[PDB]
Amino acid sequence: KPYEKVRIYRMDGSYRSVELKHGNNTTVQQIMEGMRLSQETQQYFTIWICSENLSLQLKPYHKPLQHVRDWPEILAELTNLDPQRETPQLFLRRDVRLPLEVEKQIEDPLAILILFDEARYNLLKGFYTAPDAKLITLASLLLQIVYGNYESKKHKQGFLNEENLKSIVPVTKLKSKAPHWTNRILHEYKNLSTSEGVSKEMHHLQRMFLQNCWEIPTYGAAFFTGQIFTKNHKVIPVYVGVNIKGLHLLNMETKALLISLKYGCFMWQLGDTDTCFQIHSMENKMSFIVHTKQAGLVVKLLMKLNGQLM
Amino acid sequence: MREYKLVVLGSGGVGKSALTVQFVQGIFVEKYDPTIEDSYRKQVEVDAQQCMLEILDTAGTEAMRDLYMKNGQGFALVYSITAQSTFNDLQDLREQILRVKDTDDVPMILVGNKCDLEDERVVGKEQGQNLARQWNNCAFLESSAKSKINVNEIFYDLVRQINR
Numbered sequence: 516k517p518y519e520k521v522r523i524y525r526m527d528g529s530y531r532s533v534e535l536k537h538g539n540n541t542t543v544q545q546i547m548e549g550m551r552l553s554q555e556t557q558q559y560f561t562i563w564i565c566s567e568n569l570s571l572q573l574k575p576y577h578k579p580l581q582h583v584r585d586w587p588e589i590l591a592e593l594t595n596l597d598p599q600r601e602t603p604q605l606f607l608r609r610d611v612r613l614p615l616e617v618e619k620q621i622e623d624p625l626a627i628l629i630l631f632d633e634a635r636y637n638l639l640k641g642f643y644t645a646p647d648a649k650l651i652t653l654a655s656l657l658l659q660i661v662y663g664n665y666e667s668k669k670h671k672q673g674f675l676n677e678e679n680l681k682s683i684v685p686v687t688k689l690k691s692k693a694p695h696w697t698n699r700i701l702h703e704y705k706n707l708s709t710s711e712g713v714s715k716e717m718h719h720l721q722r723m724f725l726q727n728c729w730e731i732p733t734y735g736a737a738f739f740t741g742q743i744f745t746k747n748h749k750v751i752p753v754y755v756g757v758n759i760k761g762l763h764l765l766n767m768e769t770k771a772l773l774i775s776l777k778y779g780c781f782m783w784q785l786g787d788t789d790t791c792f793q794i795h796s797m798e799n800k801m802s803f804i805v806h807t808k809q810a811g812l813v814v815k816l817l818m819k820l821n822g823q824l825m
Numbered sequence: 826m827r828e829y830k831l832v833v834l835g836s837g838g839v840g841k842s843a844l845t846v847q848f849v850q851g852i853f854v855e856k857y858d859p860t861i862e863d864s865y866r867k868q869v870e871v872d873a874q875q876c877m878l879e880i881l882d883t884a885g886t887e888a889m890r891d892l893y894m895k896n897g898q899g900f901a902l903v904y905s906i907t908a909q910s911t912f913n914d915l916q917d918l919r920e921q922i923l924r925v926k927d928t929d930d931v932p933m934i935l936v937g938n939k940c941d942l943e944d945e946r947v948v949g950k951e952q953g954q955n956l957a958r959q960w961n962n963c964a965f966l967e968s969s970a971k972s973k974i975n976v977n978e979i980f981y982d983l984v985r986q987i988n989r
């Protein structure tokens with residue numbers, strides 16, 4: 516009755532309340548046990564702590580409510596933001612260390628829908644760079660998943676307005692490029708619905724969406740914030756994407772993919788004070804420095820995910 | 826896209842979570858894990874318009890009932906056809922909602938769940954229909970979270986009631 520509890524959110528804005536059996540000393544491991552997940556579902560996910568401008572994956576031993584309590588100090592350590600705009604929340608999200616090989620193993624419908632929701636969130640936010648063709652395929656799969664079977668009478672004309680397009684294309688493409696895709700999306704949408712060889716089972720359609728995402732360079736990336744200086748010395752705010760594939764820089768403003776490097780094709784060096792890191796592109800005559808108080812976290816994660824490949 | 830705040834209410838074990846998870850995720854929850862408070866989001870089409878459902882799956886007992894009822898636009902009152910006590914408990918919930926809302930015009934549906942357990946039926950279909958009529962001709966369905974009978978219709982009917 517006088518028990519403490521916390522909301523664990525997902526990217527779609529849904530949440531599950533979990534009892535805190537040890538109050539603010541309750542660990543990630545204990546909260547994960549408190550979720551309605553089998554060990555089949557649990558192993559792919561962990562608790563993240565996220566405010567608008569900082570997302571951290573927590574480890575089984577971490578005490579998430581103490582991170583909530585200490586958030587202003589964590590922001591001051593890792594960022595140059597003001598803590599007024601940032602009260603953090605706890606999220607269930609993909610473990611950044613999950614190998615793509617293991618994720619391709621997954622048959623569990625709940626695990627698939629959680630990965631699917633997170634993948635869709637990243638697509639719509641513009642964190643996935645892919646050719647117009649790939650994005651149109653993903654848009655067609657979201658139409659089948661969200662709106663059901665194509666019907667000429669409903670979908671042919673005056674359906675894909677900006678309201679409906681917003682839910683199936685990246686926000687970065689919505690205004691300028693997406694409106695010219697409408698006919699190609701609807702064609703692939705019709706092709707899905709009228710293809711009896713394509714399973715209409717929800718977890719089957721969601722895995723198809725994920726299949727198309729697995730080939731995107733930034734897929735399953737943890738994103739950090741930093742700045743690069745151009746060679747006169749213009750400051751460019753960047754997202755640093757670190758995933759099981761390598762390192763990815765996005766222009767923060769446009770989400771444009773500036774560089775994508777696979778593990779084994781680049782080296783890193785941590786700055787003297789964890790305020791910057793240097794990338795050298797092995798056999799590419801290219802070098803750049805990212806300024807970020809998250810430099811220590813970026814290099815730590817690069818070391819872990821590079822080391823994971825055997 | 827219009828937002829709809831739906832609340833699933835009822836005593837412990839009736840299948841509030843099972844119905845919600847079946848509707849939202851297309852999965853049947855086998856394990857009985859007593860709910861604290863869960864919120865689900867689902868885009869649906871009702872009467873040719875895209876609707877964003879926010880479904881609050883509540884605890885079988887108390888806490889935040891008055892708050893749920895103040896904020897909620899539509900209420901699924903769920904009993905198990907397997908458990909007389911769960912049917913008896915719904916009268917108190919109905920009256921509480923009308924009290925907090927301060928009107929009899931509240932979007933609401935009476936749901937007799939676990940209609941796949943025909944053999945174990947303690948509450949008759951006619952007794953369910955009888956209660957709904959008494960509740961100012963309240964909407965009534967017999968449902969199954971396992972068999973997927975009248976699962977979608979619970980939430981669609983509440984959206985239609987909110988739209989009137």
Ligand SMILES: Nc1nc2c(ncn2[C@@H]2O[C@H](COP(=O)(O)OP(=O)(O)NP(=O)(O)O)[C@@H](O)[C@H]2O)c(=O)[nH]1
Nearest residue numbers: 837838839840841842843855859860885939969970
């Ligand atoms: N056969 C059958 N079992 C069902 C059905 N709905 C729920 N159950 C079972 O009944 C049990 C309780 O279901 P659950 O959704 O957890 O009930 P609840 O109303 O959410 N309980 P609480 O109030 O504690 O949160 C589970 O074992 C579940 O599988 C149904 O339609 N048919």
Ligand SMILES: C[C@H](NC(=O)c1ccccc1/N=C\c1c(O)ccc2ccccc12)c1ccccc1
Nearest residue numbers: 570571572573574589611737811812813815816819
């Ligand atoms: C979150 C971060 N520490 C870790 O999660 C951590 C744990 C063990 C080894 C290295 C780690 N640091 C890098 C990260 C990682 O390995 C895995 C995933 C990450 C996701 C996002 C960001 C970083 C990491 C922290 C920060 C402030 C206070 C406490 C903890």
Ligand SMILES: [Mg+2]
Nearest residue numbers: 841842859860
């Ligand atoms: Mg429940």
